[PDB]
Design a protein around this ligand. Structure first.
Ligand SMILES: Nc1ncnc2c1ncn2[C@@H]1O[C@H](CN(CC[C@H](N)C(=O)O)CC2CN(Cc3ccc(Cl)cc3)C2)[C@@H](O)[C@H]1O
Ligand SMILES: [Zn+2]
Length: 147
């Protein structure tokens, strides 16, 4: 199905497909509630597309208020800030053998970060993607040992 046609009713369908629980990788993570087919559009990484140069001061502000800072790097110029206007996708942890991957899609001139399943994902599994200094806890055989 075409990419804009696939961005269909993600809000309703992701609410039934994924949930947030404690993760053995780190803190809380995103896990699936039902089997997700390979190639399936899982969830949008919801948030505000902001200028990359603004992230330092935004993270400094959040940190000074004891508010967890949730951001996803688009490119060297833009970042999605999911801190205030985010959804469950902000809890997706890194893995060196991920079952998901992140892509920047464009629908009706608007940029959205969407998470896709790389393989069939089975009920109970944690959803992970390769993030674009910090030790890694994915626990995979082929672990890069750093994020
Ligand atoms: N494979 C991994 N191995 C080790 N650590 C990993 C791995 N994948 C992700 N992480 C950590 O999660 C951070 C990204 N966050 C994902 C969701 C996080 N698990 C959370 O519970 O908030 C959102 C960040 C904002 N949130 C604030 C926060 C800080 C500390 C704690 Cl305990 C809970 C929340 C963290 C990333 O920067 C790493 O620090
Ligand atoms: Zn790893």
């Amino acid at each position: 199905l075409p990419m804009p046609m696939r961005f269909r009713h993600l809000k309703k369908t992701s609410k039934e497909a994924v949930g947030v629980y404690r993760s053995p990788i780190h803190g809380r993570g995103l896990f699936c509630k039902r089997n997700i087919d390979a190639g399936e559009m899982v969830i949008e990484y919801a948030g505000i597309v902001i200028r990359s140069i603004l992230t330092d001061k935004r993270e400094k502000y959040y940190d000074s208020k004891g508010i967890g800072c949730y951001m996803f790097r688009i490119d060297d110029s833009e970042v999605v800030d999911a801190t205030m206007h985010g959804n469950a996708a902000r809890f997706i942890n890194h893995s060196c053998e991920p079952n998901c991957y992140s892509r920047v899609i464009n629908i009706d001139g608007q940029k959205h970060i969407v998470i896709f399943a790389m393989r069939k994902i089975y009920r109970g599994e944690e959803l992970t993607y390769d993030y674009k200094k910090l030790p890694c806890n994915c626990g995979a055989k082929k672990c890069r040992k750093f994020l």
